[PDB]
Amino acid sequence: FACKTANGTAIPIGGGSANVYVNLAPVVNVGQNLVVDLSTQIFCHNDYPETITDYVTLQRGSAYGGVLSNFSGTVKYSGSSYPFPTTSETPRVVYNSRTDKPWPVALYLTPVSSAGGVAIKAGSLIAVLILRQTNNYNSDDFQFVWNIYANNDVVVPTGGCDVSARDVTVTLPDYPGSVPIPLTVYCAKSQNLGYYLSGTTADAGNSIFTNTASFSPAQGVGVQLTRNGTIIPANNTVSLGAVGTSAVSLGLTANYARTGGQVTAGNVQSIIGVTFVYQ
């Protein structure tokens, strides 16, 4: 039993714990969300298949780590699903050739939000997996640890639904023009969704986000969002109806709006949060 990652990097085997860097592509699925498909990221083989057969199981106590430590879910191991953190030893995977074959493991998370996410930066710990290796000819029976680290920055969805982008940037035409905001949401199964806006406002109507531009800020103006011509105040939930597997636009447009006194020349910037809720 000897393994390497997708880019060909050897995983030092047995003995001390190994730190294994993998690419992940987390997505919502029905009832659980994929965190990482390891089967495209870790490949193993047997250097003596004519005379030795290798067996590997995933041991009890394998679990998420780092920012995912408090989540539970499931592990798909060799085509079958088990609770994760693991509560029993899995069946074995057999390595019976010199040709590399996947380590057939995928990690899933049980949703706890509507459309939330947890950022995982490259270099961060994802999971701690405990493996047990045996064979078909002697008593060798050794257990060792693979610490699975992100090779790439991702946002792991924690809900039933996911968004087109977690960080959206738009630029208004020069005052007084407006700009549509490209932002959509979809769900793994049909869900009834709403959303609300968060941020600092300047006006009696709690609907004009303050201008926080750092350099040469314009005075007397902020940013106001509308959907189909209707102003959306902060902290007032907008309904999206039922969102299915195809993306639904939030329907948002950004506008300038006056906050009082003279409008003066300069830069404008506002940072506005969007939070989804089930309805």
Binding site: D167, V168, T171, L172, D174, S270, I271, G273, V274
Partner: peptide, 13 residues
């Protein structure tokens, strides 16, 4: 929040 929107603009002189 689940998404952050940054809106930039300008009032020209």
């Amino acid at each position: 929040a689940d998404v952050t929107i940054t809106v930039n603009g300008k009032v020209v002189a």
